C-alpha cells in the first residue's frame, strides 16, 4: 500500500458525476456509450458570431472542461467543428478549421494527459436538424470532442 498505488492520481467518481451533472445542467451535452465519450458545445456560447474569437468569460468553461477531461486515461482525442452556411463552402470550412485549431491548442497547452489530438472542421455538411432558421444561434453549429476511456 505505501508503495503500490491504490488509486489513479486525482480520481474521484463522486467528482466525475458531480461535474457531469453540472455540465448537463449548463446545457453542454455529455454522452457516454460503452467505452466512448462525446461532448458537444454550442458555437454561440463559445465563439464570436461568424468569426474565430474567444470571449474572456469562455475560459472559465474551458477550464472546467479541461479539469473534467483530466480525470481519464486515453490515447487519442478527436475534435470536430460544425457551423452554418454563410457565404461559400471554403468560408465555413476554414472557420471550423481555425476554431478547432484554437481549442485544440489551448487544450494541449493545458496539461491534458493525452498522446494524440486530431482536429477537423466541416462547417454545415451534416446538420442535425432540417430546421435551420438560426445562424450561429442554430443548435447545429457546435464543437464536438470524442474519445475513449482506455482500460
Amino acid at each position: 500500500v505505501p508503495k503500490l498505488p491504490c488509486r489513479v492520481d486525482g480520481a474521484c467518481d463522486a467528482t466525475i458525476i458531480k461535474m457531469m451533472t453540472d455540465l448537463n445542467k449548463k446545457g453542454i451535452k455529455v454522452a457516454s456509450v460503452g467505452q466512448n465519450y462525446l461532448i458537444s458545445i454550442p458555437a454561440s456560447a463559445l465563439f464570436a458570431d461568424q468569426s474565430p474569437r474567444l470571449n474572456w468569460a469562455s475560459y472559465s468553461l474551458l477550464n472546467e472542461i479541461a479539469a473534467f477531461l483530466k480525470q481519464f486515461r486515453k490515447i487519442a482525442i478527436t475534435v470536430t467543428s460544425y457551423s452554418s452556411k454563410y457565404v461559400s463552402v471554403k468560408r465555413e470550412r476554414a472557420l471550423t478549421l481555425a476554431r478547432s485549431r484554437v481549442v485544440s491548442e489551448y487544450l494541449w497547452s493545458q496539461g491534458v494527459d493525452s498522446r494524440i489530438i486530431f482536429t477537423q472542421g466541416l462547417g454545415s455538411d451534416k446538420p442535425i436538424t432540417s430546421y435551420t432558421l438560426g445562424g450561429d444561434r442554430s443548435p447545429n453549429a457546435r464543437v464536438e470532442i470524442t474519445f475513449r476511456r482506455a482500460v
Binding site: 451535452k29 454522452a31 456509450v33 460503452g34 467505452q35 466512448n36 442535425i128 436538424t129 432540417s130 443548435p139 447545429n140 482500460v151
Partner: protein, 173 residues
C-alpha cells in the same frame, strides 16, 4: 384485467384501473395517472430498467442488452422482462410517423458467417415483434451486424459484455 403475455396484443387500459381503485378519489387518481403517463415518468421507468435511451437533437436512439431482453444464444425472447417491452411500445406510440431503423450486434468470437446470421435473426425477430405490436410495416428497416463496428473493446470481459446489443434509431420527419 391484464395478461402478462403482451395482453393479447391489446392496448393497455391502466388509467381506468387506477381511477377505479382510487375512487373505491377521482381527482387524485387522474393526477397520478397523468403524472405516470408523462413522458418524464416513462423515461425514469426505462432508466430504472436496464435499458438505455439517448436523445440528440431530433434523432433518438434506444439501446437494449441482448442477454437481459433475449433468450440465451437463440432467437427466442425472455418472458419475464415484458414490462420493459410494454413501456417500449407505450413510448413509441408518441411518434406515430417517423421511420425506424433497428440493428443487432454481437461480440467478436465465432464464425463470421455464424455471427452475421445470428445478428440478422435477432434483429428480424425484434422488428417482427414491433410490427405485430401494431406498427405500420412500411416504416421499418432491420439489419444484423456482427463484430463489424463495436462500441468498446472485445479483449476484456465487461467490454465484451457491453459489446453485444440491440440498437434502435429514429428521426422525427
Amino acid at each position: 384485467c391484464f395478461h402478462p403475455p403482451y395482453n393479447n396484443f391489446q392496448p393497455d387500459r391502466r388509467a381506468v384501473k387506477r381511477v377505479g381503485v382510487d375512487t373505491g378519489g377521482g381527482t387524485v387518481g387522474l393526477v397520478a395517472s397523468i403524472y405516470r403517463d408523462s413522458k418524464r415518468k416513462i423515461i425514469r421507468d426505462l432508466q430504472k430498467q436496464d435499458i438505455q435511451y439517448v436523445e440528440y437533437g431530433d434523432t433518438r436512439t434506444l439501446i437494449i442488452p441482448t442477454d437481459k431482453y433475449f433468450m440465451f444464444s437463440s432467437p427466442r425472447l425472455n418472458e419475464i422482462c415484458y414490462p420493459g417491452l410494454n413501456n417500449v411500445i407505450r413510448l413509441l406510440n408518441f411518434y406515430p410517423q417517423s421511420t425506424i431503423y433497428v440493428a443487432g450486434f454481437t461480440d467478436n468470437v465465432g464464425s463470421r458467417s455464424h455471427k452475421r446470421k445470428l445478428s440478422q435473426a435477432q434483429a428480424e425477430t425484434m422488428m417482427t415483434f414491433l410490427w405485430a405490436n401494431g406498427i405500420a410495416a412500411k416504416r421499418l428497416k432491420a439489419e444484423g451486424y456482427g463484430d463489424k463496428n463495436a462500441i468498446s473493446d472485445n479483449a476484456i470481459i465487461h467490454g465484451s459484455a457491453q459489446n453485444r446489443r440491440i440498437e434502435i434509431q429514429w428521426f422525427t420527419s
